[PDB]
Amino acid sequence: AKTYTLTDYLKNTYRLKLYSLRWISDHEYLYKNILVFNAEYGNSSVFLENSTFDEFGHSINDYSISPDGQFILLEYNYVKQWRHSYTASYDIYDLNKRQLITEERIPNNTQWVTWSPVGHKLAYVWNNDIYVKIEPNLPSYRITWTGKEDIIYNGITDWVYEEEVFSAYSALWWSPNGTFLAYAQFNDTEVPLIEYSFYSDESLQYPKTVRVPYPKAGAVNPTVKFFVVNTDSLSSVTNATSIQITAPASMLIGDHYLCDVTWATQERISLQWLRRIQNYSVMDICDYDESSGRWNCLVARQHIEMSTTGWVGRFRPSEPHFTLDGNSFYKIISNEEGYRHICYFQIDKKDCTFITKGTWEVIGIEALTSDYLYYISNEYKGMPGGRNLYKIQLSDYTKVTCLSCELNPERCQYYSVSFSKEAKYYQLRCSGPGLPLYTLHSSVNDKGLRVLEDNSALDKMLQNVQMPSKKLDFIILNETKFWYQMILPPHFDKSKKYPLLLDVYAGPCSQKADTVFRLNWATYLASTENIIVASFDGRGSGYQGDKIMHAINRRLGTFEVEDQIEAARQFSKMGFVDNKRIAIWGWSYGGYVTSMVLGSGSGVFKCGIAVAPVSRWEYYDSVYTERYMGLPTPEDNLDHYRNSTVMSRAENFKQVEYLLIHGTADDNVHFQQSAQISKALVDVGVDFQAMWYTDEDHGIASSTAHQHIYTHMSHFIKQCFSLP
Amino acid sequence: HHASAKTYTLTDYLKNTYRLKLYSLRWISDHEYLYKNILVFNAEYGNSSVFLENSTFDEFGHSINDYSISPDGQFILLEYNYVKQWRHSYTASYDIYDLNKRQLITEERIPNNTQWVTWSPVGHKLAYVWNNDIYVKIEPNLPSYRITWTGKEDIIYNGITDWVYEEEVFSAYSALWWSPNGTFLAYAQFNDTEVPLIEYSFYSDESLQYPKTVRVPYPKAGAVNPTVKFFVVNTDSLSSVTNATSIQITAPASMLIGDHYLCDVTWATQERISLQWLRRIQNYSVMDICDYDESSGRWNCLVARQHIEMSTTGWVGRFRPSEPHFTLDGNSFYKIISNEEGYRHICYFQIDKKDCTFITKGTWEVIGIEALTSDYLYYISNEYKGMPGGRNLYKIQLSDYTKVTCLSCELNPERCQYYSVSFSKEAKYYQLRCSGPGLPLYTLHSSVNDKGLRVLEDNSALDKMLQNVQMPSKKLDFIILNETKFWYQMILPPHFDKSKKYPLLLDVYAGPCSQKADTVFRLNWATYLASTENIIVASFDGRGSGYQGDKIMHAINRRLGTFEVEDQIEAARQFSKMGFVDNKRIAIWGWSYGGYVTSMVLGSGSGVFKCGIAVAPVSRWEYYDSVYTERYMGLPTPEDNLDHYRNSTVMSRAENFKQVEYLLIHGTADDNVHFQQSAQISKALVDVGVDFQAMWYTDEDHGIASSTAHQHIYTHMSHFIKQCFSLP
Numbered sequence A: 001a002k003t004y005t006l007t008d009y010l011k012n013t014y015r016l017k018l019y020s021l022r023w024i025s026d027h028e029y030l031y032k033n034i035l036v037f038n039a040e041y042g043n044s045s046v047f048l049e050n051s052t053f054d055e056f057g058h059s060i061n062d063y064s065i066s067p068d069g070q071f072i073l074l075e076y077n078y079v080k081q082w083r084h085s086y087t088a089s090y091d092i093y094d095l096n097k098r099q100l101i102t103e104e105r106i107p108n109n110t111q112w113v114t115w116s117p118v119g120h121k122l123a124y125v126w127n128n129d130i131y132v133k134i135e136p137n138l139p140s141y142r143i144t145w146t147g148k149e150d151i152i153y154n155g156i157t158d159w160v161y162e163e164e165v166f167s168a169y170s171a172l173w174w175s176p177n178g179t180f181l182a183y184a185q186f187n188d189t190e191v192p193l194i195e196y197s198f199y200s201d202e203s204l205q206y207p208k209t210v211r212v213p214y215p216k217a218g219a220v221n222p223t224v225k226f227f228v229v230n231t232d233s234l235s236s237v238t239n240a241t242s243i244q245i246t247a248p249a250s251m252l253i254g255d256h257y258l259c260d261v262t263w264a265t266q267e268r269i270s271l272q273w274l275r276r277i278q279n280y281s282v283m284d285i286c287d288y289d290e291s292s293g294r295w296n297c298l299v300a301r302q303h304i305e306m307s308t309t310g311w312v313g314r315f316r317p318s319e320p321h322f323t324l325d326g327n328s329f330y331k332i333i334s335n336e337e338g339y340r341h342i343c344y345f346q347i348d349k350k351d352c353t354f355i356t357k358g359t360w361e362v363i364g365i366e367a368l369t370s371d372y373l374y375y376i377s378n379e380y381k382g383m384p385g386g387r388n389l390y391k392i393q394l395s396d397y398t399k400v401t402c403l404s405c406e407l408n409p410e411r412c413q414y415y416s417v418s419f420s421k422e423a424k425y426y427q428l429r430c431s432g433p434g435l436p437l438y439t440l441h442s443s444v445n446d447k448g449l450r451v452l453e454d455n456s457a458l459d460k461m462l463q464n465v466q467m468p469s470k471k472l473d474f475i476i477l478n479e480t481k482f483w484y485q486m487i488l489p490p491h492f493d494k495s496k497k498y499p500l501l502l503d504v505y506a507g508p509c510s511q512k513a514d515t516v517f518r519l520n521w522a523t524y525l526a527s528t529e530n531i532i533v534a535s536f537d538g539r540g541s542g543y544q545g546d547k548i549m550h551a552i553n554r555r556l557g558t559f560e561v562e563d564q565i566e567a568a569r570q571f572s573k574m575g576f577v578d579n580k581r582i583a584i585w586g587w588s589y590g591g592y593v594t595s596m597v598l599g600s601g602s603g604v605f606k607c608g609i610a611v612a613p614v615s616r617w618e619y620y621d622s623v624y625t626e627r628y629m630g631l632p633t634p635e636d637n638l639d640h641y642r643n644s645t646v647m648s649r650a651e652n653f654k655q656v657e658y659l660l661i662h663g664t665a666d667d668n669v670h671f672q673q674s675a676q677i678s679k680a681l682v683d684v685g686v687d688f689q690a691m692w693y694t695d696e697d698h699g700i701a702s703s704t705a706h707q708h709i710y711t712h713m714s715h716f717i718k719q720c721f722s723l724p
Numbered sequence B: 001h002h003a004s005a006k007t008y009t010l011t012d013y014l015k016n017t018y019r020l021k022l023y024s025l026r027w028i029s030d031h032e033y034l035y036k037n038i039l040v041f042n043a044e045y046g047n048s049s050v051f052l053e054n055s056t057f058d059e060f061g062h063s064i065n066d067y068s069i070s071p072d073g074q075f076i077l078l079e080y081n082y083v084k085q086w087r088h089s090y091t092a093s094y095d096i097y098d099l100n101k102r103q104l105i106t107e108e109r110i111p112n113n114t115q116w117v118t119w120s121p122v123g124h125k126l127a128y129v130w131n132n133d134i135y136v137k138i139e140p141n142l143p144s145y146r147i148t149w150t151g152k153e154d155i156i157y158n159g160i161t162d163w164v165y166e167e168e169v170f171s172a173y174s175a176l177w178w179s180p181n182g183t184f185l186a187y188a189q190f191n192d193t194e195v196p197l198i199e200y201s202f203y204s205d206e207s208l209q210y211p212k213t214v215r216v217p218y219p220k221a222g223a224v225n226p227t228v229k230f231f232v233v234n235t236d237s238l239s240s241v242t243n244a245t246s247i248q249i250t251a252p253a254s255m256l257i258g259d260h261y262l263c264d265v266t267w268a269t270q271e272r273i274s275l276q277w278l279r280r281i282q283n284y285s286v287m288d289i290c291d292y293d294e295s296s297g298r299w300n301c302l303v304a305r306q307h308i309e310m311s312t313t314g315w316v317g318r319f320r321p322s323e324p325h326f327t328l329d330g331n332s333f334y335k336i337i338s339n340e341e342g343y344r345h346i347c348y349f350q351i352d353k354k355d356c357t358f359i360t361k362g363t364w365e366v367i368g369i370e371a372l373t374s375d376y377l378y379y380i381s382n383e384y385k386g387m388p389g390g391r392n393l394y395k396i397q398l399s400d401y402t403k404v405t406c407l408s409c410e411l412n413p414e415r416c417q418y419y420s421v422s423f424s425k426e427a428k429y430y431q432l433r434c435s436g437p438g439l440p441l442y443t444l445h446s447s448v449n450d451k452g453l454r455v456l457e458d459n460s461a462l463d464k465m466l467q468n469v470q471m472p473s474k475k476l477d478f479i480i481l482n483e484t485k486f487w488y489q490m491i492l493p494p495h496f497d498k499s500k501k502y503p504l505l506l507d508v509y510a511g512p513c514s515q516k517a518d519t520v521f522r523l524n525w526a527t528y529l530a531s532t533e534n535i536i537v538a539s540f541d542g543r544g545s546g547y548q549g550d551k552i553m554h555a556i557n558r559r560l561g562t563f564e565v566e567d568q569i570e571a572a573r574q575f576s577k578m579g580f581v582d583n584k585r586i587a588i589w590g591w592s593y594g595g596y597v598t599s600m601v602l603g604s605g606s607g608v609f610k611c612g613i614a615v616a617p618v619s620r621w622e623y624y625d626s627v628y629t630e631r632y633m634g635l636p637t638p639e640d641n642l643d644h645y646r647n648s649t650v651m652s653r654a655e656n657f658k659q660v661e662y663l664l665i666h667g668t669a670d671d672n673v674h675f676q677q678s679a680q681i682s683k684a685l686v687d688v689g690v691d692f693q694a695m696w697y698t699d700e701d702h703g704i705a706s707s708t709a710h711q712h713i714y715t716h717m718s719h720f721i722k723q724c725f726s727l728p
């Protein structure tokens, strides 16, 4: 008789239980007490007691066991930087001796730490330089002497590489047996700085000015170098010698990126490079030479990947999966029909043969063994929004087994997977449409060992609450399927008219209509406020082939915007939608599209909310922006850069109720972007509503800020919909 | 029919439907003034033809922001390419036109980006400041003499003020003072080397790809203040063979003892200049009197001549120590100081003496000395009918202080009770400006016979337009608290019914020496709210307000955010007790200090106010500037007043905001009250889970004065108020 309230969402009354494991062998894995588990039986017992480090003094944020299990690294003093980057203090614990190591310790304010893949070698980054420890208690060797704050990054990424290329702070790649440590070096000397105020605590008298080298569209980019150093032959008397691997000649002719690093074998590494115009990428295969101690990347072994219709990869070229001998690999590339499928490449020839095909896409290669290739795709039922684990037989490609399709077809249609070190076991994670379900399997016969978490605890509670449902479906548009989803209020009556809120992202390769179960803001709006919240994947959206995804190439703020308006038009004709009460909201790219929609003059939407929106593409970073827009120069794409601003649509905002929200310490979509929107609206005399968030960044993710923002939006929406 | 059906609408206010006409004039002699096409109106007769046709600069190729005529009337100075900096400071291009040779001077032109230019008071000598250095031209077509060589952007200022001196001390960018016949050029020089910078984003036009970080040396409470030196150069002994020699005048020993300020410069004669210095603890000030020694070519401030002004109740002066007005021989002066009773009156000082003698007395105050001849002293005060919010011109006989004549009191007693005055070069004529309660009125007067010569502007065009519109009225009265009178005003809706219950907006400033209850006629936002929206908008001068003596004014000394806050709440309680207020609909708004008082009121937990708007509020006194803040608050050190610094933040009241509806407005490019202060307020309301309305103004400053921004904020505020009061 009670509903899922805003408070329920904000305080997580109804917790979604996870089951996070970290494999350590081919049949064992860890689980947070921190106990070990057996995939076979489930026996053993404990690894570390709930409070053995009670007498540490500091509060432990995370742990990391060495591969051989002889040492555990303890992380504390965590200071977040950007999305993936941060700073921490570290101590190492000898698991055998049962004592904290106190000689030659890892320094304070360490940027990144990593074990070698086998054994207990250690590499860390401090003050933008790389250090190596053969043994946890011996003096570390300094690898690099060039690291300078905001200027040179050794073994760590700068702003743009962090956010837009590697989705990681780390730029260190150990060879499979720990012999070689490969790293990248970024140079930002000439990359312009973004500056913004950070007000900080009330005690701070004068505001701090934050500075980060951040390349906006068409600006000077960071340059990148790639090195490889031999850790087995490290000298405590002479400096470490780093062999450089230069980019291919087809890359060195202009600005370029390093977009992938993947070790093939103990003495072979693959590198992928991307031109600044992101429609051409090359893969180098580099072997270690013992006569010279150098690395050779045969020009004949280069593999080219390009696109005539758009950019390469979903957000970057796919990563290769090497056969053990490293003379072959599989990777996802789009076929001649434009659908992303798995291609098999032989190291010493031009042609690859495709091993999957059809009008659906492979999402990822999960593991490869001697006999089988494992991958997740949206093939099941032609639904782009589902995800199932498949097995393909290497000796015969037509022999394909769906390992998750029928495990529970009603409650489970969206899977991810985690395989053991050698793929003998795998954990399946099901994310919807029913409550999440975590199961454990043996890959020898593909039967299920046991249920790891079934979420019945949560299921019991949701029995008493009036919950919304999800409709997943498509509309036909120009002889093409476009998918949408709806969070429908409980006791849904299709003869009554409901206010509708369009929830938008709609960036390139986005997908907002899927089979995932979520407890979120939409959930409360549906449950308590009886609002329908819909999402739509129009042109530019992903996992439906290049025809749809590349439709907005060089033309951002066009078709994907038009299609959201059309979706709304379509939902009005569904009969149960009150077309005097349609609203639209989105974050980031979604804030942009919401703003573009509201300023289009369509008359379809009464109101909207844009959170941290891009307002004009020259303000956003090069890597993301240029992938879709090219350069903002007269000989490239300036005209569309100038045409696709939200500012230029300010006059049409007179027709709608607008709320614009932005965190003042947004390193990503700079406050600048909203500042220019508000200025344009003021300049044409449009009244609207605003909210800044002091020192909040792109996430607006502080516990209190998070609560304030969703509360503020609730009132705005409820006000727009005449809801008390 | 023919009954008034129109009201004074928001559009009327924003679009300037009903315009007040002014009468701006500039005296050039003791019997002639200029006015706009430029005409040299004659005060007596009137035979006065065009001085400059409006077309005379058609061929210029730049728009002319402003003009200035040399005292001798031989040259005109054309100001163009004006670019605003702070409240008074700006940058402009200049060109000089020869008013006799009828052409532009093309040789040795004044440079672009000039910070200040100024004619000598006689002849046509010129002093300008460029790149922070002073330059002099004896003749407009001749090369400049460089006076200073030490000018450095943001560090060394010669002849111009820095941020805080501009805003809080001189109310001007200029720091140059010519001697009466233009022989000497006196100047201040400021040193900001160690003064910390405020930094903030300036977004600029949308074509700017990367935001700009503006930085300005800006001393917050207790921070390292700028230092100041003072010099005098003889402009007649300038040479194009040697660098100009500037004679430093040092500060008195009592000031050099710690952090001090230059707070006043006034020439007495051709060879005598008076300085006033102020201690950082602004309760002690010293006037020096410096005579030019003819043989050595130096300046001498004799220790015996030093005049000390102080206070044991608060600070000295209303905002700074008052300015002296010297007699012709320079052996004597008159200035406004507070008496034994705490009231500010004109004291008469002899140079070679200790104690002065008060020429005025009473339970009122002198507002300003306006002119002194050898026979009469002219001043404005609020004596008439004991109305602190009134203003009249008075004339006291120098030889008999019992002979005081009001010159403006009865000219028009009904439409006119608030006057200012503009005297001719030697006070033979004066223009009177009446600013209310009726429509503004401008008249011209001969001071020999005191009778009126002519009506300059009577605003009859405006009076015509108003005949048909239901305008509000004003209630100016007082209430008694602790047997002390405290004045309020109410802007009352047309057809005011004392038997009805109106919603009330409390319009607040309430900072030290503020006055919000007066006799001035105004066409503002409040006019619309009353006329169109039927909201009573009231204002109240409680403890801390000025023009009523140190007893009221110093009541909040060292205790900012206490009584003035408490008095605004009590005022609302009195208004509701008056029987015509709906106490379910009482709001409050303010700008600057009034933003702070609003915030403190809305966080008081009083229960009296439903909603409020703070525009560019102070949130915590450590964020605001040293000169204004330390005047009332002392230093934020443990051994001074830090305790009350920490106790008077709006942040610490955040919890109480759950009871009110709050709109918080601030311009992002505000160099005065930094955006910082509202950003700290919002973070605090966010931390205690309070919902509120916000609005930033991109690139606007403390004024939010851009045409479009101005219209936007008042439209936005109107919505919020109408919402709060359930008005359709």
Ligand SMILES: *[C@@H]1O[C@H](CO)[C@@H](O[C@@H]2O[C@H](CO)[C@@H](O)[C@H](O)[C@H]2NC(C)=O)[C@H](O)[C@H]1NC(C)=O
Residues within 6 Å of the ligand: A146, A152, A187, A188, A189, A190
């Ligand atoms: C990082 O890149 C910068 C920018 O090119 C390099 O700086 C140049 O270095 C050379 C040799 O020292 C100088 O002649 C140039 O004048 C420098 N340019 C600028 C603008 O600083 C720098 O060498 C690179 N850093 C490293 C070690 O890779």
Ligand SMILES: *[C@@H]1O[C@H](CO)[C@@H](O[C@@H]2O[C@H](CO)[C@@H](O)[C@H](O)[C@H]2NC(C)=O)[C@H](O)[C@H]1NC(C)=O
Residues within 6 Å of the ligand: B150, B156, B191, B192, B193, B194
């Ligand atoms: C402005 O004031 C600063 C002090 O804040 C002066 O700096 C000093 O200059 C002297 C003389 O050159 C040096 O000996 C000192 O090292 C400086 N001290 C400090 C504290 O910086 C500066 O010279 C002054 N500028 C002018 C031209 O008046």
Ligand SMILES: N#Cc1ccccc1Cn1c(N2CCC[C@@H](N)C2)nc2ccccc2c1=O
Residues within 6 Å of the ligand: A149, A150, A198, A208, A209, A210, A211, A212, A213
């Ligand atoms: N910038 C800056 C800055 C300026 C003055 C003193 C200290 C710092 C350090 N710093 C910071 N930098 C860390 C070093 C690399 C640099 N690009 C960013 N980033 C942020 C970000 C958010 C809140 C605070 C800070 C911060 O204090």
Ligand SMILES: N#Cc1ccccc1Cn1c(N2CCC[C@@H](N)C2)nc2ccccc2c1=O
Residues within 6 Å of the ligand: A163, A164, A315, A505, A507, A587, A588, A589, A590, A614, A620, A668, A669
């Ligand atoms: N962030 C960001 C951002 C900002 C401005 C324009 C576009 C984007 C892209 N983007 C996004 N990722 C895209 C892949 C690289 C990763 N950096 C960000 N993720 C999500 C997630 C949820 C809702 C919107 C978005 C989104 O717009």
Ligand SMILES: N#Cc1ccccc1Cn1c(N2CCC[C@@H](N)C2)nc2ccccc2c1=O
Residues within 6 Å of the ligand: B153, B154, B202, B212, B213, B214, B215, B216, B217, B669
């Ligand atoms: N700051 C700065 C700055 C930074 C980079 C280039 C140019 C300038 C000049 N400048 C400026 N300064 C003028 C010189 C004295 C200095 N304190 C302030 N103040 C403001 C203020 C508001 C909007 C723009 C500007 C501006 O461009």
Ligand SMILES: N#Cc1ccccc1Cn1c(N2CCC[C@@H](N)C2)nc2ccccc2c1=O
Residues within 6 Å of the ligand: B167, B168, B319, B509, B511, B591, B592, B593, B594, B618, B624, B628, B672, B673
């Ligand atoms: N400005 C400002 C400001 C900012 C923060 C706190 C206090 C003040 C004082 N003040 C003010 N002047 C006072 C004399 C020095 C001059 N700089 C400002 N003028 C007006 C005018 C109208 C409404 C409020 C105010 C006001 O609060």
Ligand SMILES: *[C@@H]1O[C@H](CO)[C@@H](O)[C@H](O)[C@H]1NC(C)=O
Residues within 6 Å of the ligand: A038, A041, A043, A044
């Ligand atoms: C459980 O596994 C542990 C792993 O070390 C093994 O030693 C033990 O024999 C097993 N115990 C039982 C009772 O199954």
Ligand SMILES: *[C@@H]1O[C@H](CO)[C@@H](O)[C@H](O)[C@H]1NC(C)=O
Residues within 6 Å of the ligand: A089, A105, A106, A107, A108
């Ligand atoms: C890290 O910093 C803390 C506090 O300043 C200090 O006590 C400790 O010795 C440091 N640890 C290392 C490994 O440098």
Ligand SMILES: *[C@@H]1O[C@H](CO)[C@@H](O)[C@H](O)[C@H]1NC(C)=O
Residues within 6 Å of the ligand: A177, A178, A179, A266, A267
């Ligand atoms: C790791 O690989 C290197 C390079 O091929 C090789 O020399 C070494 O024997 C390997 N180490 C071990 C112990 O497997």
Ligand SMILES: *[C@@H]1O[C@H](CO)[C@@H](O)[C@H](O)[C@H]1NC(C)=O
Residues within 6 Å of the ligand: A277, A279, A280, A306, A307, A308, A630
């Ligand atoms: C890459 O993009 C540019 C600009 O859109 C285009 O002219 C060029 O033909 C493309 N190159 C390839 C390899 O398709």
Ligand SMILES: *[C@@H]1O[C@H](CO)[C@@H](O)[C@H](O)[C@H]1NC(C)=O
Residues within 6 Å of the ligand: B045, B047
């Ligand atoms: C200005 O007016 C006076 C007074 O009537 C008159 O005598 C005089 O001739 C006029 N000035 C000239 C010379 O035009």
Ligand SMILES: *[C@@H]1O[C@H](CO)[C@@H](O)[C@H](O)[C@H]1NC(C)=O
Residues within 6 Å of the ligand: B093, B109, B110, B111, B112
């Ligand atoms: C001022 O600037 C304009 C345009 O740059 C130029 O023509 C003129 O000569 C300049 N004047 C001086 C004296 O610097």
Ligand SMILES: *[C@@H]1O[C@H](CO)[C@@H](O)[C@H](O)[C@H]1NC(C)=O
Residues within 6 Å of the ligand: B149, B241, B242, B243
């Ligand atoms: C004037 O003073 C400056 C700086 O002190 C010096 O550089 C300049 O040469 C002097 N002028 C002359 C030529 O006397």
Ligand SMILES: *[C@@H]1O[C@H](CO)[C@@H](O)[C@H](O)[C@H]1NC(C)=O
Residues within 6 Å of the ligand: B181, B182, B183, B270, B271
């Ligand atoms: C102005 O005053 C100075 C100093 O008293 C004096 O020497 C000079 O003669 C005066 N100038 C004129 C033109 O009377």
